[PDB]
Design a binder for this molecule. Structure first.
Ligand SMILES: [Mg+2]
Ligand SMILES: [Zn+2]
Ligand SMILES: [Zn+2]
Ligand SMILES: [Zn+2]
Lengths: 50, 45, 50, 64, 1123, 58
RNA sequence: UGCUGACU
DNA sequence: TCGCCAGAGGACAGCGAGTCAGCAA
């Protein structure tokens, strides 16, 4: 959160409320949730010999 | 009990009306006001 | 050394393990908050030479 | 100044891999192997640690 | 050397090193050599040059009563800054850390010891205190000299600072190298406005700029008159005086007319117009009355005595010597050498007139040199010391003229009577920048001499100590020929780094390898060595014909006539001495040999410059491999390959150190500048100096005005290796962003850019501004009782809980318009004044410095409050890449509407692909791939220009890097549409590029006015943004609005909004001045005709009534017909 | 920021790279009639230099 | 009011 | 031999808009 040196002090109260990742990213619950279509690969000819 | 930290000595000097603005234990002429505990509210956005 | 607004920002982006389904949304202008909609945490740290 | 808490593009939390990153680099590991051993797969996260400049260590050197 | 240990490719394992924060044992040494010309010049100006300056200083003799008194200044000494008098305690030294906290000048004490005598047998040495002269930061008269980085951190300094600046009121003036013509070298010029100087003058003439020991400069012009005669123009105290040559030549030398003649016809002894014109110069004006050196000196003395202001008891022959010593050829001590130099400048005007030589362009760097901070400082110091002498003895002569016998009792009380002078004059030249001098110092410019050095970034700051200004007068010129970027500034000035508006071509910057000469040497064994080499002294026996011989010059002094078949070998021998450091040839002497053919090429001859203000640059001397230094004029006669395999056998005398030597320090920070078009690299250089970055490490100490800070900077993953030589990661400037080049939104077109909203909410490019306001409360009052003490009378309802009992906000409190901001207390009366915060923006107080009076005796009158203003990227803020692609932020696109890639990623910058086709910034398309490859492999690639050829391409290299990571060669990954969810048909080009955030924000450039203040002379809106202020409509807008036929929109804008009054007129007299009110039925009555039934009100502008009044002022009458 | 359609760019020569622009507010009800009828931005489709269109997509 | 920067 | 065609230089007056800032006299 921070770094301190002798004589330095932090003192605070944080309030946590409910919300959706739409009005601020901090409230978003997933790193990423993407999707991808399944690739399809077809060998039209028998590949061989290096 | 208004405290001011020296510029390089870092001694707490309390200054008032009618008195000069030098620092004790040295003689420097710049002194920073000190942060007291007062409540401030910030938003995390 | 970390500012107050920058500290507030950094604190907003920290994920809390409370499950949001047991809570509720704070009504508009509900600054105080209650057991129903808020969680409070405290950071109080001071650095000293050992 | 200090490590960003969450990667900007994605949001993945990288604010806890700073000291681990520094420790794996002191052990002899390349930045690639090090970023792999921390779980930073996509390059958006890898740039968040690879190119971080810790200037909180240079500000924390002038008098109180 | 000095360019070894230059990194071969950049690294990233220096950050993430176990020793990142430990302050180092010695300072960097590459950053130090940037401000080296500003510091090494001052070091001379203040110690070794000050003694020489005072040594000239002719003893100021004058008459008191029936007595003649002589005052000479034996020494002058400037002392490091220190607490004023001993009235202070515990530390005599004074470090620049303060005077930035307080707002004061870092000034040292200048004191001299004068010696006054009465006829030379009665004498006493008094030591007067002249005044205070400002001091540079690491300048040998400063308290931060010889301090390692660790000890430089306990005084609040940058641990990496190179001062080279002055602190005048805590503002860090940065006096910058101006361009001067040259020193001690005759430049033959063809200027057509010269024939207006007299009846028969021509447009030909050789100018010489003479400098003696860096304390005196003078400009002398030899003009050609149509008769074949040459005139001499000298300037004394800003007045131009014309002396025929011959008067000057006969005075300087006690030689026969034939010997003077045999000298001016040395190389052209067959020409007969010349032989005839020389005789006309010697006889026509000198056999007319004066034929012995003394009679010439006597005649010249009488004509010039009145305007040289010489002593009345001076023989006229002594007043002539005064003119020759102070106005012609200052550089040469002898009068015999001054003769030979005036003779070579004439021998040259005769060749320019007969078209045997080419005019020297004054705008080529070949014939240019720089004016350093020490030359301006000493040249002002010397002039002010002379002025101090003059003023003290003005006071002397004016007081009583009374029996000095007992008056030796108040001699010190007399000298001190005018020793009260030298301090404020000096601060004007530094605080204001403009020069108030009786002689303009042989300068040609009297403003913009010193400028503010602003640390917005460390790339704005480092460019103030490498700037070179052609002149401030050239900003006002129809013709643009001093803005041409000639091929002679190769390696000395950067092609790309020039301001790109009104200052273009006029404000240049030195390349990275270029450097100013600042050392001073003996140069006394050189004239005796040149003779061993083959030169024949000016005295005689050239061994050839004076036409097959080169005229040798060495710093204004003509050694003379090296033979024509010995000149090449002599030049090569002298160049080998300087390279191998043999003899005593300074490592930086410029051995020039301008060959002579039959063509009208530049005047032939072997010059040898060693003066302290020329620009030099390193080049690998082939055939010796010993890293020579060449100058601007010496570089035109030598071949310098850039890459190897460009070196040939006979050709390629030298070779350049690195291929990017030609580019400036900032132009070496642009990645792949070779693949972008040039106007774009000129905008990148100007945009890297307006970037919000990390400006410095010492907050709480600076007390500047504005200071923009970026929260979390990063270091570019693709950067030139020079970025790593001058560690520029101590001060980062931007952030790496995942940019996709896609047309997706409809809001990113025409130069506008899109920013993901979740990236912006996760801290992307957040920033802040620090507004430090110095409240000195000696204002609001004059020299009365102290109305000034910060303080709160107990219980004021106004400051109930916003201040903290010393009339100063709390540290950490938030301020908003209308909030209490300070509270003074007039101590005698006992009344407080809350002084509310009026900015319409929110900030937080982060520190408050209480400052004293410099004697530790101040009384709570001055304070410095620093407010912090959060400036995060809004819509309307300007972003930019490192390739001149600036654009505003038009949208913050939701993070779920962004096109996601097949890897789960989602760009955070959307950049329209239509800025490439017309701007041709192909370096951005390579930086994207290089940065993506870097982020993928954990590497750090270099973007040094000229490292990737046609055979080895950059796209091939980085596409192979990408294809080695599982991505595709061409850098395109295929995205999905975040709005429809379908894989777009085109595969998109995505990558990682380094964005900077510019300092121009809509929050600082937005205005709305409804009603408000008014100019009281015209009664129109005031016209500013800090004041409410209206926007000007304009004549172009008035002429484009009545092309619509809208006469009532014009009536509204120009009449009902700006100014509209009801001035009433007398209808019969038809005059606006005539109606006058009465003494209270208030009837305006016409004064000219006493009727009150004739007055009628008319709706008329207010500037029209002002116009009628100012016309009446001239007796003109405006009679207007009312209907 | 004052947002403007991109068809009206070539008419002003605006380029969205920091391009401050002024907005005036008629106050008479007789200059509004002329701003509506004469100065409107669709009566301005053709440049008066040679009558060729000015507004267009880009 | 002027000189220095700066924006299109 | 001086009026008018020629002939000379000297003087003046113009040099795109509109913005924002700081510093100092
Ligand atoms: Mg534009
Ligand atoms: Zn102290
Ligand atoms: Zn990520
Ligand atoms: Zn009347």
């Amino acid at each position: 959160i921070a770094q301190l040196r002798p004589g330095q002090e932090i003192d605070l109260l944080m309030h946590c409320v409910k919300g959706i990742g739409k009005d601020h990213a901090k409230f978003s619950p997933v790193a990423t949730a993407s999707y991808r279509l399944l690739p399809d690969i077809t060998l039209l000819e028998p590949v061989e010999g290096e | 009990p208004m405290i001011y930290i020296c510029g390089e000595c870092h001694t707490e000097n309390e200054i008032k009306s009618r008195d000069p603005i030098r620092c004790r234990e040295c003689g420097y002429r710049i002194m920073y006001k000190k942060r007291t505990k007062r409540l401030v509210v910030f938003d995390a956005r | 050394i970390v500012q107050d607004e920058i500290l507030a920002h950094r604190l907003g982006l920290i994920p809390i393990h409370a499950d949001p389904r047991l809570f509720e949304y704070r009504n508009q202008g509900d600054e105080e908050g209650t057991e129903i909609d808020t969680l409070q945490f405290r950071l109080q740290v001071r650095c000293t030479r050992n | 100044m200090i490590i960003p808490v969450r990667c900007f593009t994605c949001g993945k939390i990288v604010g806890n891999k700073w000291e681990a990153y520094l420790g794996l680099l002191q052990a002899e590991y390349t930045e690639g192997d090090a970023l792999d051993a921390l779980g930073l797969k996509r390059y958006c996260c890898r740039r968040m640690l690879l190119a971080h400049v810790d200037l909180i260590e240079k500000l924390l050197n002038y008098a109180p | 050397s000095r360019w070894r240990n230059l990194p071969s490719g950049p690294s990233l394992k220096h950050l993430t090193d176990p020793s990142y924060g430990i302050p180092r044992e010695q300072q960097k040494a590459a950053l130090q050599e940037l401000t080296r010309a500003h510091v090494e010049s001052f070091n001379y100006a203040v110690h070794e040059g000050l003694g020489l300056a005072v040594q000239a200083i002719p003893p100021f003799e004058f008459a008191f009563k029936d007595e003649r008194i002589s005052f000479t200044i034996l020494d002058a000494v400037i002392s490091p800054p220190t607490v004023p008098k001993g009235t202070i305690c515990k530390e005599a030294n004074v470090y620049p850390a303060e005077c930035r906290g307080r707002r004061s000048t870092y000034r040292g004490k200048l004191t001299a010891d004068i010696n006054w005598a009465v006829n030379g047998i009665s004498k006493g040495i008094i030591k007067q205190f002249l005044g205070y002269v400002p001091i540079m930061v690491k300048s040998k008269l400063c308290n931060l000299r010889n301090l390692p980085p660790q000890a430089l951190i306990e005084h609040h300094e940058e641990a990496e600072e190179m001062g080279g600046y002055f602190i005048i009121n805590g503002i860090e003036k940065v006096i910058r190298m101006l361009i001067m013509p040259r020193r001690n070298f005759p430049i033959a010029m063809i200027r057509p406005k010269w024939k207006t100087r007299g009846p028969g003058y021509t447009q030909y003439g050789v100018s010489m700029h003479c400098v003696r020991e860096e304390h005196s400069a003078v400009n002398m012009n030899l003009h050609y008159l149509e008769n074949g005669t040459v005139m001499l123009n000298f300037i004394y105290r800003k007045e131009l005086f014309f002396l025929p040559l011959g008067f000057a030549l006969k005075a300087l030398v006690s030689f026969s007319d034939y010997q003077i003649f045999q000298e001016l016809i040395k190389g052209k002894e067959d020409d007969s117009f010349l032989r005839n014109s020389v005789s006309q110069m010697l006889r026509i004006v000198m056999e007319e009355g004066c034929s012995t050196q003394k009679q010439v000196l006597n005649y010249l003395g009488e004509c010039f005595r009145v305007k040289l202001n010489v002593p009345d008891w001076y023989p006229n022959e002594q007043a002539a010597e005064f003119l020759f010593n102070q106005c012609i050829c200052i550089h040469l001590k002898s009068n015999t050498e001054k003769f030979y130099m005036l003779c070579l400048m004439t021998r040259k005007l005769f060749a320019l007139a007969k078209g045997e030589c080419m005019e020297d362009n004054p705008d080529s760097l070949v014939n240019q040199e720089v004016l350093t901070p020490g030359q301006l400082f000493l040249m002002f110091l010397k002039e002010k010391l002379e002025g101090w002498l003059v003023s003290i003895k003005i006071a002397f002569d004016k007081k009583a003229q009374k029996t000095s016998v007992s008056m030796n009792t108040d001699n010190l009380m007399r000298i001190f009577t005018m020793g009260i002078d030298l301090t404020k004059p000096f601060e004007y030249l530094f605080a204001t920048g403009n020069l108030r001098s009786k002689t303009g110092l042989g300068l040609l410019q009297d403003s913009g001499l010193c400028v503010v050095a602003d640390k917005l970034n460390f790339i704005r700051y480092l460019s103030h100590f490498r700037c070179v200004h052609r002149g401030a007068d050239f900003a006002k010129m129809r013709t643009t020929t001093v803005r041409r970027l000639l091929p002679e500034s190769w390696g000395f000035l950067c092609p790309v780094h020039t301001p790109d508006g009104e200052p273009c071509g006029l404000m240049n910057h030195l390349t990275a390898v270029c450097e100013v000469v600042t050392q001073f040497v003996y140069t006394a064994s050189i004239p005796a060595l040149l003779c061993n080499l083959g030169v024949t002294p000016i005295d005689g026996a050239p061994h050839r014909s004076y036409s097959e011989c080169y005229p040798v010059l060495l710093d204004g002094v003509m050694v003379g006539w090296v033979d024509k078949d010995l000149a090449p070998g002599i030049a090569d021998s002298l160049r080998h001495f300087k390279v191998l450091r043999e003899k005593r040839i300074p490592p930086w002497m410029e051995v020039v040999l301008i060959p002579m053919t039959g063509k009208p090429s530049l005047y032939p001859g072997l010059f040898l410059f060693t003066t302290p203000c020329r620009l030099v640059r390193p080049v690998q001397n082939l055939a010796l491999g010993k890293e020579e230094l060449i100058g601007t004029m010496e570089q035109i006669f030598m071949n310098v390959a850039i890459f190897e395999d460009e070196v040939f056998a006979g050709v390629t005398t030298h070779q350049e150190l690195f291929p990017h030597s030609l580019l400036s320090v900032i132009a070496n920070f642009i990645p792949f500048s070779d693949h972008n078009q040039s106007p774009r690299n000129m905008y990148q250089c100007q945009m890297g100096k307006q970037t919000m970055g990390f400006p410095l490490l010492t907050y709480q100490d600076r007390s500047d005005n504005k200071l923009y800070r970026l929260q979390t900077p990063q270091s570019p993953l693709v950067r030139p290796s020079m970025y790593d030589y001058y560690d520029m990661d101590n001060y980062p400037i931007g952030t790496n962003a995942i940019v996709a080049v896609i047309s997706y939104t409809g809001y990113d077109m025409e130069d506008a850019m899109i920013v993901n909203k979740a990236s912006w909410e996760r801290g992307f490019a957040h920033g802040s501004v620090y507004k430090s306001e110095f409240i000195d409360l000696s204002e609001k009052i004059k020299q009365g009782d102290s109305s000034l003490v910060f303080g709160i009378k107990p219980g004021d309802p106004r400051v109930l809980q916003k201040l903290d009992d010393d009339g100063l906000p709390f540290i950490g409190a938030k301020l908003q318009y209308g909030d209490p901001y300070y509270s003074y207390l007039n101590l005698n009366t006992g009344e407080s004044f809350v002084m509310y915060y009026k900015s319409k923006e929110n900030c937080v107080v982060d520190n408050i410095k209480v400052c004293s009076n410099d004697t530790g005796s101040g009384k709570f009158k001055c304070v410095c409050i620093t407010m912090r203003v959060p400036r995060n990227p809004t819509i309307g803020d300007k972003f930019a890449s490192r390739h001149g692609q600036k654009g505003i932020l038009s949208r913050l696109w939701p993070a779920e509407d962004m096109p996601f890639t097949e890897s789960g990623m989602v760009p955070d910058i959307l950049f329209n692909p239509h800025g490439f086709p017309s701007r041709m910034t192909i370096g951005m398309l390579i930086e994207s791939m290089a940065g993506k490859s870097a982020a993928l492999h954990g590497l750090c690639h270099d973007a040094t220009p000229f490292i990737f050829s046609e055979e080895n391409s950059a796209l091939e290299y980085f596409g192979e890097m990408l294809k080695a990571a599982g991505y595709n060669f061409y850098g395109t990954e295929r995205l999905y549409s975040g709005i429809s969810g379908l894989e777009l048909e085109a595969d998109i080009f995505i990558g990682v590029v380094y964005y900077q955030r510019l300092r121009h924000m809509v929050s600082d450039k937005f205005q709305v006015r409804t009603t408000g203040a008014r100019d009281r002379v015209t009664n129109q809106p005031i016209g500013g943004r800090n004041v409410q202020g209206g926007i000007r409509f304009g004549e172009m807008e008035r002429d484009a609005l009545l092309a619509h036929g809208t006469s009532f929109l014009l009536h509204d804008r120009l009449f009902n909004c700006s100014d509209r009054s009801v001035a009433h007129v007398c209808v019969k007299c038809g005059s606006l001045l005539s109606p006058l009110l009465e003494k209270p039925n208030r009837k305006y009555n016409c004064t000219l005709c006493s009727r009150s039934d004739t007055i009628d009100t008319v709706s008329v502008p207010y500037v029209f009534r002002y116009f009628v009044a100012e016309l009446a002022a001239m007796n003109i009458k405006v009679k207007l017909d009312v209907v | 920021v004052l947002r403007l359609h991109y068809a009206n760019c070539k008419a002003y020569n605006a380029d969205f790279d920091g391009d401050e622009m002024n907005a005036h507010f008629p106050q008479s009800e007789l200059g509004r009639a002329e701003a509506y009828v004469l100065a409107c931005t669709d009566q301005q489709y053709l440049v008066p230099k040679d009558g060729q269109p000015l507004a267009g997509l880009i």
